[PDB]
Design a protein around this nucleic acid. Structure first.
Ligand SMILES: Nc1ncnc2c1ncn2[C@@H]1O[C@H](COP(=O)(O)OP(=O)(O)OP(=O)(O)O)[C@@H](O)[C@H]1O
Ligand SMILES: Nc1ncnc2c1ncn2[C@@H]1O[C@H](COP(=O)(O)OP(=O)(O)OP(=O)(O)O)[C@@H](O)[C@H]1O
Ligand SMILES: [Mg+2]
Ligand SMILES: [Mg+2]
Ligand SMILES: [Zn+2]
Lengths: 633, 436
DNA sequence: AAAAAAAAAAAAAAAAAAAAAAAAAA
DNA sequence: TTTTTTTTTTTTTTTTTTTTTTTTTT
């Protein structure tokens, strides 16, 4: 009534006080308008802006406090004012055939500092209901996208006029209203037959996601907790399972909560939900300074050595394995070939070695430094847990598929630990993914082929406790030959007792164990708790890790080198020399070694930020594979 | 009650323009109207389907623009809403149906006998028109070539995917590209139901416009108005009109799925002569109307305002013998010479070597004599070829390649799936839960 | 003619964990 | 010979929700 109009006036004043929002409205409007005029087209921007809570805090403390504390009485007044401003801006007429019926009202999004309203799915209780909150977590489950009716239009014969009926739901609006039965009117007020006219009605896409707490922040002895978020309109399909997200929305109650005709019970409570306003991913955009630095650092001669050594500075030695990991990070170029085939561009590495040889501390580093990485353990995994699982969608009722570890890491890496301890029934599935890079599901009436293009790095142990040099290589490794053929580089690492090596490595380890984080006193235990302050503002030389991430991203997305003849000449001579020799290698040499040389050469070419494969790339690939197969170093 | 809104579209002028377009339209390139020719063809019990082209409608609009008189952009009205224009066009066809010009040929048509028997008793001593109809009306999507010829852009024929189908496209005419995975059998769906009434008046007709209905079972004729309890209605199948119905599922192609996601699926309903146009395993481009399903019955309450959806199909565009031509192809290949070596060599030209293996695969491709000896003896002509050898010798390209040559072939692999010996007699098919 | 009460409508099923047998070998 | 290995075999439904549509009952 009066309060609604007063708040509309307040927000209207706020809008012309700061001119940025008015300019963004015009930019979106002109973009959408002149896009439709391009008949010879080469797509549509949604009606949603992001305002900062901070600026509103200086403008009007009362309105900011109302939005943060009582959103359900201050957001709808703001949306009407934004719609009015947007309607005022659009001077050009749009006599469209059916856009007159559906207005697509403008909505709002928020950013800035939330103070005490930044929480997690665990610290969210009944004290935060009907409040604007932001929750950080990991997406686990998503529902199928369905259309929902918002307004129905009917045509009346013998009169020629139209009649519309509006529908509302608890999840649709922020205010509780009288419910609607969602049944189309059939009789006019005068009794004339009504015909439903699809194409003038309004439907909106609806989705439900589940956000779980980060498992690293959970208390001792407790399992992580999860919450449900509802997305609508233009927020649909902006998240996938496994993603790390931050969702800003209104925490809301729903239902009757067992205080009704049903029997009295202590086990019945209310249901809680979040109507998300905004979603933020917790792709690093690069400026011209960063790109210029990358191009300047590319021209240095010893760039490969620096890049490889920058990996895991807390590991002493293992230079060649660290080079192989870097070559994994910058994968090869995939070739699509006739007969529906593709040559894989991924590099797969296996490490077999003695106990306590820093095999498992490199997989953990790859988990952190890479863009996408999935961790797996041999004994705690199953075949149905790696490829896909048949489940049900509670909200709609169909039967669907849920992704597994391999398919969730498409265009990523999978790090498997204790690979030899995996059961045989489990080990067949990974075989297929390593060969075809596709999963075939033919269960419960769901016949589908799923794409899985991932790089595999694995660590295992020999049959006995330690590697034996007096026995043949195949006796030491329990893995079958078919599985072993699918790895590009097999590294056998051994711990040998030598006084100088021990003196150096012990010094390095003792130096590492004496590190104090800044801002901590001696003897002060590390407080890895953050004190519930999740965030302050809601949205020889070595190189730093973020710079390496930028370098890897830029190389993967900007250069695609092509093979040359003079590199092929080196590759063929290396292959012919390696094949025809009496040296006893730890792995047999076959016709698939040539493809490994080609892939390593392509990766080294990408490292140099060049569009051609040179002779030096072939030499580096040859040296790496000679070290891997022979140990001639 | 129900508020009222003003919309630009008026159906009276649209109906006038449809009537004008049916009569006036001529193919500019038989002479005369294009569609009154095929209507006369229909009237002779020969054509079972009527297909309208929106390119032709644009041609009529362009003719009117040449005259300069205003039009109602019928092509845009069809695209924005198409469930009502089907009935409008059906009425327009019914109004201007030509007379049977030749070969009336009434032989044993049960509906014809019923209708003819009605005339004598009705005249000596108003039914739903759809009962007398036989033709089926389908629309044809726009063409980019004609569009680019007259600009105006195009939306109905753009090859969208299952995933790009949002809720804003409901009630429009669109096209979807995908692969057909499942197709069901053809079953009859009722359109007009006729009830016979204990020699009370005569049979009554009701139309059905949903997937679910209720029987009448009460005779309301003037002679049946007498008060005595007399009995309910019984359905008569012969005087009722049925239709062929089929449902299929289309799935998104692997190329169009983004990384980390699972492909979606869409449902297609086809009625009429268009039935059986799609088979499993075909990559097609299907045009139709995208409509909301009612989702009623059980589990409707939990959804509340959530609906299913489906596509009423109207057009199909599949992307991809003894004759003198093949009689001459074999002669040409004979004159080519070196048939043995060339046939063996061209098999998988990527792989270099193993030429004797390629000779043997040719002999496996052809089959030996299968002679049925008397007294029960039989001799096999099929070929059993096993290829052993060390790993990494091109073992498993050679095989796959041979599968391409012969259409009747299956590539079966290890214990990942059980298909070699899966001659099972139990099949828990979800559709009906009976063994196959 | 207008109230209060009472049912239908389920459907579904793979994926994992524990325990006892009936065949393999240092 | 006593050890390891191996298939494999039931394990499943007891519950749900508010409309929507039917029969009784003042
Ligand atoms: N070269 C090294 N530099 C630094 N620390 C090392 C090195 N080698 C081993 N370590 C230390 O040894 C410990 C165990 O290493 P890690 O867990 O990586 O071994 P592993 O190869 O996975 O062993 P396992 O065979 O028992 O699974 C860690 O504390 C690690 O820091
Ligand atoms: N004669 C040949 N000509 C061309 N390529 C060959 C030849 N022999 C082997 N190859 C190579 O071998 C590969 C094809 O066989 P591949 O090693 O993939 O499978 P396979 O022989 O069935 O072995 P596995 O036991 O590893 O499955 C390709 O890399 C191909 O280039
Ligand atoms: Mg380990
Ligand atoms: Mg093979
Ligand atoms: Zn009667």
């Amino acid at each position: 009534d009066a309060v609604f109009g007063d708040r509309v006036r307040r927000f209207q004043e706020f809008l012309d006080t700061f001119t940025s929002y008015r300019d963004s409205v015009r930019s979106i409007q002109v973009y959408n308008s002149n896009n439709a005029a391009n008949y010879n087209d080469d797509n549509i921007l949604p009606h949603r802006i992001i305002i900062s809570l901070d600026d509103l805090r200086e403008f009007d403390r009362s309105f900011w406090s109302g939005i943060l504390v009582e959103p359900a009485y201050f957001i709808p007044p703001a949306e009407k004012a934004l719609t009015d401003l947007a309607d005022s801006m659009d001077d050009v007429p749009h006599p469209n055939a059916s856009a007159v019926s559906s207005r697509h009202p403008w909505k709002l999004s928020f950013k800035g500092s939330f103070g005490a309203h930044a929480l997690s799915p665990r610290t969210l209780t009944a004290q935060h209901l009907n409040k604007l909150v932001s929750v950080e977590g990991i997406v686990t489950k998503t529902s199928l996208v369905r259309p929902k009716l918002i307004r129905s239009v009917h045509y009346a014969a013998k009169t020629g006029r139209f009649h519309y009926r509006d529908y509302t739901d608890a999840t649709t609006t922020l205010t509780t209203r009288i419910p609607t039965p969602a049944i189309y009117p059939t009789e006019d007020t005068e009794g004339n037959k009504l015909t439903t006219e699809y194409g003038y009605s309004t439907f909106i896409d609806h989705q439900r996601i589940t956000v779980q707490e980060m498992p690293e922040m959970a208390p001792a002895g407790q399992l992580p907790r999860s919450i449900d978020v509802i997305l609508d309109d233009d927020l649909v399909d902006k998240t996938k399972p496994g993603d790390r997200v931050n969702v800003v929305g209104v925490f809301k109650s729903l239902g009757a909560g067992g205080m009704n005709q049903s029997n009295s019970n202590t086990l019945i409570g209310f249901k809680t939900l979040i109507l998300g306003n905004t979603v933020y991913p917790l792709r690093q955009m690069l400026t011209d300074f960063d790109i210029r630095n990358i191009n300047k650092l590319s021209k240095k001669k010893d760039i490969f050595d620096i890049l490889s050594q920058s990996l895991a500075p807390s590991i002493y030695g293992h230079d060649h394995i660290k080079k192989a990991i870097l070559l994994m990070l910058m994968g090869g170029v995939e070739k699509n070939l006739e007969n529906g085939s593709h040559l894989r561009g991924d590099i797969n590495i296996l490490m077999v070695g003695d106990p306590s040889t820093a095999k498992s501390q490199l997989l953990r580093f790859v988990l952190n430094t890479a863009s996408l990485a999935i961790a797996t353990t041999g004994r705690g995994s199953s075949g149905v847990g790696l490829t896909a699982a048949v489940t049900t969608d509670r909200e709609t009722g169909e039967r669907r598929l849920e992704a597994g570890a391999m398919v969730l890491a498409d265009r990523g890496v999978v790090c498997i630990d204790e690979f030899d301890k995996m059961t045989d029934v489990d080990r067949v599935a990974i075989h297929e993914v390593m060969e075809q890079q596709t999963v075939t599901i033919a269960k419960a009436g769901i016949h589908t082929t799923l794409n899985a293009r991932c790089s595999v790095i694995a660590a295992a142990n020999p049959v006995f406790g330690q590697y034996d040099v007096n026995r043949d290589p195949h006796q030491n490794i329990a893995l079958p030959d078919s599985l072993l053929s699918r790895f590009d580089l097999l590294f056998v690492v051994t711990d040998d007792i030598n006084e100088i090596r021990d003196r150096s490595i012990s010094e390095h380890v003792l130096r590492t164990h004496r590190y104090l984080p800044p801002g901590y006193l001696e003897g002060e235990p590390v407080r890895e708790r953050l004190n519930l302050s999740l965030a302050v503002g809601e949205d020889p030389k070595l190189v730093t890790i973020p710079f390496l991430r930028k370098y890897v991203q830029y190389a993967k997305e900007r250069v695609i080198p092509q093979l040359t003849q003079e590199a092929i000449n080196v590759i063929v001579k290396n292959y012919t020399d390696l094949r025809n020799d009496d040296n006893t290698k730890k792995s047999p040499i076959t016709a698939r070694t040539l493809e490994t040389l080609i892939r390593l050469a392509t990766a080294h070419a990408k490292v140099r930020l060049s569009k051609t494969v040179n002779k030096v790339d072939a030499k580096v690939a040859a040296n790496l594979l000679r070290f891997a197969l022979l140990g001639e170093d | 009650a129900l508020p009222s809104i003003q919309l630009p579209v008026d159906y009276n002028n649209l109906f006038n323009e449809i009537t004008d377009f049916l009569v006036t339209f001529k193919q500019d390139t038989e002479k005369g109207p294009k569609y009154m020719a095929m209507l006369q063809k229909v009237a002779n019990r020969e054509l079972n389907s009527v297909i309208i082209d929106l390119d032709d409608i644009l041609q009529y609009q362009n003719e009117k623009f040449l005259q300069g008189t205003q039009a109602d952009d019928l092509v845009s009205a069809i695209q924005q809403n198409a469930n009502h224009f089907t009935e409008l066009f059906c009425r327009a066809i019914d109004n201007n149906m030509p007379l049977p010009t030749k070969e009336i040929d009434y032989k044993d048509d049960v509906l014809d006998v019923i209708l003819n028997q009605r005339r004598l008793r009705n005249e000596r001593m108003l039914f739903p028109p759809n009962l007398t109809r036989r033709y089926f009306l389908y629309f044809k999507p726009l063409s980019q070539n004609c569009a680019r010829r007259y600009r105006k852009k195009a939306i109905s024929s753009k090859p969208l995917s299952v995933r790009q189908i949002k809720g804003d496209f409901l009630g429009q005419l669109i096209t979807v590209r995908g692969i057909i995975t499942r197709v069901s059998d053809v079953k009859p769906a009722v359109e007009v139901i006729a009830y016979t009434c204990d020699q009370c008046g005569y049979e009554v007709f009701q139309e059905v416009n949903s997937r679910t209905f209720t029987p009448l079972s009460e005779c309301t004729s003037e002679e049946c108005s007498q008060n005595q309890t007399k009995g309910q209605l019984f359905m008569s199948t012969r005087a009722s009109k049925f239709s062929a119905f089929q449902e299929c599922k289309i799935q998104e192609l692997s190329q169009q799925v983004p990384v980390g996601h699972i492909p979606r699926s869409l449902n297609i309903h086809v009625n009429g002569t268009l039935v059986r146009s799609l088979s499993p395993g075909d990559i097609v481009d299907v045009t139709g109307i995208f409509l909301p399903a009612p989702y009623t019955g059980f589990k409707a309450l939990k959804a509340g305002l959530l609906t299913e959806t489906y596509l009423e199909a109207q057009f199909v565009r599949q992307h991809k013998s003894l004759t003198s031509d093949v009689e001459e192809r074999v002669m040409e290949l004979i004159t080519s010479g070196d048939v043995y070596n060339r046939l063996a060599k061209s098999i998988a030209p990527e792989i270099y070597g193993n030429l004797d293996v390629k000779k043997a695969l040719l002999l496996l491709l052809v089959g030996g004599v299968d002679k049925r000896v008397g007294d029960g003896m039989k001799i096999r002509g099929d070929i059993n070829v096993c290829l052993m050898g060390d790993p990494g010798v091109a073992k498993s390209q050679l095989l796959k390649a041979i599968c391409k040559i012969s259409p009747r072939g299956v590539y079966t692999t290890g214990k990942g799936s059980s298909g070699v010996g899966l001659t099972a007699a139990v099949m828990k098919d979800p559709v009906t839960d009976e063994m196959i």
